[model samples]
Target: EAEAHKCDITLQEIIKTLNSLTEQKTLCTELTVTDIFAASKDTTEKETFCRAATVLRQFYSHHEKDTRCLGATAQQFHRHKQLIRFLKRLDRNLWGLAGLNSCPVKEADQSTLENFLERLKTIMREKYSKCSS
Candidate 1:
């Protein structure tokens, strides 16, 4: 209901911010993860986003305690910090929509998560465009 709307808005914000960061070259673009969260045949749009959101929550929570390892230089670290802030907000909204009790942490290093975010941004943009139009 109301939760779903807020979730969508948050996701839209994430996409916009990610796009800005990408244009500025503030985030890493060299690495990319295979779209492990890609939707399977016959999967609904809602289901695809939900699955990706759940995995995102896991990745964020797992690395929440140790973000220092996420970057090499101070500037890079700062960028990752900013990205983490957005991730936390996105996680909160998506968690509300899913209403899940707990999500296990999916352990991954910084480059992997960075690539994951990039892949996720594309997925969100694609889905958003389809649903909106």
Candidate 2:
């Protein structure tokens, strides 16, 4: 519990948070940063993402090798994968820090994002199939 901020567990709070998340209508962009941050059910989610970014940043800071760090899980893998994939897809697959969704540079249209997400999910599940073992 020291560095971990797990999701809020109470049903009431979860309901409240769900409502808040539902209130946001626009697609993601730089501005969604504040809205989603405020609406997120668990601050730990963002905290973990930041922590992952920090770890990736340190690795990427090195200019000598290809930086690769298996990151903490993204809540939505496709959006997140669409994230990394979108980076590569857009010719901006940068270091993990620079590849984050902090802005909309990697943003894709809804259909495109979803389709790519679905495909990547299959690959991702296969990649992590041993996790079940």
Candidate 3:
């Protein structure tokens, strides 16, 4: 019972983290490099965004490495073990793509970010479908 309860909490945390990441991604998309730089004077929102940005950036940078080191159950969800696995499969696929860290451009296009957003939406849709059934 305790393990199941802990898994439930972990699942909720994962959902919450993913949602916040998408929101932060949108807030970031709406700003240009200049806007971000200018906000250095008195902006509070950017500061908070920066912290989240840093954490996300670090996580993204390490995702591929983690994928390489993963084992059989590494792709499994803790609490939602019975949920759809397509989301996990797609997630690993995206992370395993090459040249993310070595991209020619310093910043990627909106479509690149949107692609990740769409992937996240896929997982959310599956989660909702499972809950609704």
Candidate 4:
């Protein structure tokens, strides 16, 4: 039913939607950590944010969206494809990259999920301002 929202028609709607989408994406990304044992549900955060340093990168890297905010130059799109290589190391057996990966990263660090979620909120708070502006 919300398919229309996901489509590329309103940059205004996409801003809020994509902005929120980035939070969940960021949260999931944060679950990743060094050492196989450190893997967990929120593991990909570091690598995601690391490679997705710019808004254009963020648009390319994000998976859970309806397909808006892709209004970048050809050079930007090429850069996005290039950045994808950075995440090639992700384990295919678990959390392959998108929501399809049923397995969550295992967090032995004892870090509660709250830690990552909190960080997500904080980062998104900052991102929201930019998204809104």
The number of the candidate with the highest TM-score is 1
* Candidate 1 collision pairs: none
Q: RMSD of each candidate?
A: 5.3, 17.7, 16.2, 16.6
Instruction: Give per-residue CA lDDT, model 2, range 1-133, as digits (tens).
Output: 4553222222223223223322222332112111112133443323433432332233224311222222344443334333343223212211221234653222222232223223333432343344233
Q: Which parts of model 4 have CA positions greater than 4 angstroms off?
A: 1-108
**lDDT tens readout by residue for model 4, 35-127:** 222333554433433322322233235622312322246664554443344323222211222224133333234343335434444553454
Model 1 misplacement above 4 A: 1-11, 17-35, 95-115
- Candidate 1, after superposition: displacement of residue 14 in Å? 4.4
Q: Quote model 1's TM-score.
A: 0.55
Compared with the true structure, the alpha-carbon lDDT of candidate 3 equals 0.36
Candidate 2 residue-wise lDDT at 87: 29
Worst 10 residues of 2 by lDDT: 29-38
The better-scoring model by TM-score among 1 and 3 is 1
Candidate 2: residue 84 lDDT (0-100): 40
lDDT of 1 by residue, 1-133 (tens): 4544544566577567556544423233333323444435764545544555676555456554464436667775766667567667665555455555654423433444455566656766777775543
lDDT pick, better of 3 and 4: 3
Q: Which stretches of candidate 2 lie over 4 Å from their true place?
A: 1-43, 63-133
**lDDT by residue (tens digit), candidate 3, 95-122:** 3322133222223332334444545545
How are the candidates ranked when ordered by TM-score, highest leading? 1, 3, 4, 2
Q: Evaluated with lDDT, which candidate comes out highest?
A: 1
